[PDB]
Every structure is written in structure tokens, then in C-alpha cells.
């Protein structure tokens, strides 16, 4: 054991708002990545116990996953698009930090990240 508590997805102390960019992040970016054949290892927090990765949370100190992101978006947790984009970037970076180039999980992260970059390139101007 043990896993840390997951990242928070609600906090009434955190300022938040809905923006057209955050709506795009949910409706376009997250939906595209979520349906990909390679999304599955990124859809929930790493369970280091079940996966027998005892070093995971010694190495990765700012964990993030698309389950968390989806709930943050659905819960209007974010103040702006940059906060959400930073969560996706943390998710990808963590995978590259923990694993090694050529590992299947890294190939999968790379395929998701490429789609992410393609979709974030068309992030709308703030309304
Ligand atoms: C939720 O994570 C997984 C679920 C099932 C399985 Br099999 C592997 C992972 C996983 N494993 C590793 N080594 N690094 C990761 N980075 C993001 N996912 C992972």
C-alpha cells in the first residue's frame, strides 16, 4: 500500500467560472481523448497498490489523470483554461517521468498527447 487521496475535484474555497474555452476543453478536448483506444490507463488515478508500483507516489508528487480532469470540468472547478491545460500537461509529464521511452504506456501517452496538441491548437478566443 497505500495510495494518496486523489486530487480534489471540489472545493468551495476555490474561485471558479465557466468560460467558452473551458466548455471547449470538456466538449472537444476531453471527449476526443477519452474515447481513444489508448485512454484507458489515464482514465483514473494510478492505483500503485493494484499495479504493484510502490515507488510511484515517491516519484510523482503531483499526480493527475483524466478522470480527475473530467470531474473538475463537470464540476466547474477551474477558473480558466490554463489551469485545465496545466492538468493535462502534468498528466503527460508524469507518465514520461515515471516510465521509460518505448514503454507501451509512453507510446499511449504520446498518441493522446498528439491529439491533445491538435485540439488545443484550435482553442477558441475567450468570449
Ligand atoms: C491508471 O494507470 C494504469 C492503469 C492500468 C495499468 Br495496466 C497501467 C497504468 C499505468 N501504469 C504506469 N506504469 N504508468 C502510468 N501512467 C498512467 N497510467 C499508468
UniProtKB/Swiss-Prot annotation:
Q: How is this chain modified after translation?
A: Phosphorylation by CK2 disrupt the intramolecular binding between the bromo domain 2 and the NPS region and promotes binding between the NPS and the BID regions, leading to activate the protein and promote binding to acetylated histones. In absence of phosphorylation, BRD4 does not localize to p53/TP53 target gene promoters, phosphorylation promoting recruitment to p53/TP53 target promoters.
Disease per UniProt entry: Cornelia de Lange syndrome 6: A form of Cornelia de Lange syndrome, a clinically heterogeneous developmental disorder associated with malformations affecting multiple systems. It is characterized by facial dysmorphisms, abnormal hands and feet, growth delay, cognitive retardation, hirsutism, gastroesophageal dysfunction and cardiac, ophthalmologic and genitourinary anomalies. CDLS6 inheritance is autosomal dominant. A chromosomal aberration involving BRD4 is found in a rare, aggressive, and lethal carcinoma arising in midline organs of young people. Translocation t(15;19)(q14;p13) with NUTM1 which produces a BRD4-NUTM1 fusion protein.
Quaternary structure (record): Interacts with p53/TP53; the interaction is direct. Interacts (via CTD region) with CDK9 and CCNT1, acting as an associated component of P-TEFb complex. Interacts with RELA (when acetylated at 'Lys-310'). Interacts (via NET domain) with NSD3, CHD4, BICRA and ATAD5. The interaction with BICRA bridges BRD4 to the GBAF complex. Interacts (via NET domain) with JMJD6 (via JmjC and N-terminal domains); the interaction is stronger in presence of ssRNA and recruits JMJD6 on distal enhancers. Interacts with NSD3. Interacts with NIPBL.
Quoted from the entry, the domain comment is: The NET domain mediates interaction with a number of chromatin proteins involved in transcription regulation (NSD3, JMJD6, CHD4, GLTSCR1 and ATAD5). The C-terminal (CTD) region mediates interaction and recruitment of CDK9 and CCNT1 subunits of the P-TEFb complex. It is also required for maintenance of higher-order chromatin structure.
The feature of type site (Acetylated histone binding) is located at 99
Q: Where is this cross-link: Glycyl lysine isopeptide (Lys-Gly) (interchain with G-Cter in SUMO2)?
A: 58
Q: Which residues form the Bromo domain?
A: 17-123
Describe the effect of residue 104 to G: Found in a patient with a neurodevelopmental syndrome; uncertain significance
Q: What is this protein called?
A: Bromodomain-containing protein 4
Family statement drawn from the similarity comment of this UniProt entry = Belongs to the BET family.
Name the gene for this chain: BRD4
Protein purpose: Chromatin reader protein that recognizes and binds acetylated histones and plays a key role in transmission of epigenetic memory across cell divisions and transcription regulation. Remains associated with acetylated chromatin throughout the entire cell cycle and provides epigenetic memory for postmitotic G1 gene transcription by preserving acetylated chromatin status and maintaining high-order chromatin structure. During interphase, plays a key role in regulating the transcription of signal-inducible genes by associating with the P-TEFb complex and recruiting it to promoters.
Task: Quote the record's miscellaneous comment.
Answer: JQ1, a thieno-triazolo-1,4-diazepine derivative, and I-BET, a benzodiazepine derivative, have been tested on tumors with success. Treatment with GSK1210151A (I-BET151, a I-BET derivative) has strong effets on mixed lineage leukemia and promotes myeloid differentiation and leukemia stem-cell depletion.
Source species, domain of life:
Eukaryota
Let me know which tissues express this protein, per UniProt.
Answer: Ubiquitously expressed.
Where is this chain's protein located in or outside the cell?
Nucleus; Chromosome
Amino acid at each position: 500500500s497505500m495510495n494518496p487521496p486523489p486530487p480534489e475535484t471540489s472545493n468551495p474555497n476555490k474561485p471558479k467560472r465557466q468560460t467558452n474555452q473551458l466548455q471547449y476543453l470538456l466538449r472537444v478536448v476531453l471527449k476526443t481523448l477519452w474515447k481513444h483506444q489508448f485512454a484507458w490507463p489515464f482514465q483514473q488515478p494510478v492505483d500503485a497498490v493494484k499495479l504493484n508500483l510502490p515507488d510511484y507516489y515517491k516519484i510523482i508528487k503531483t499526480p493527475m489523470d483524466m478522470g480527475t480532469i473530467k470531474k473538475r470540468l463537470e464540476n466547474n472547478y477551474y477558473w480558466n483554461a490554463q489551469e485545465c491545460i496545466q492538468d493535462f500537461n502534468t498528466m503527460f509529464t508524469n507518465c514520461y517521468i515515471y516510465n521509460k521511452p518505448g514503454d507501451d504506456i509512453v507510446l499511449m501517452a504520446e498518441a493522446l498527447e498528439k491529439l491533445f496538441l491538435q485540439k488545443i491548437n484550435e482553442l477558441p478566443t475567450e468570449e
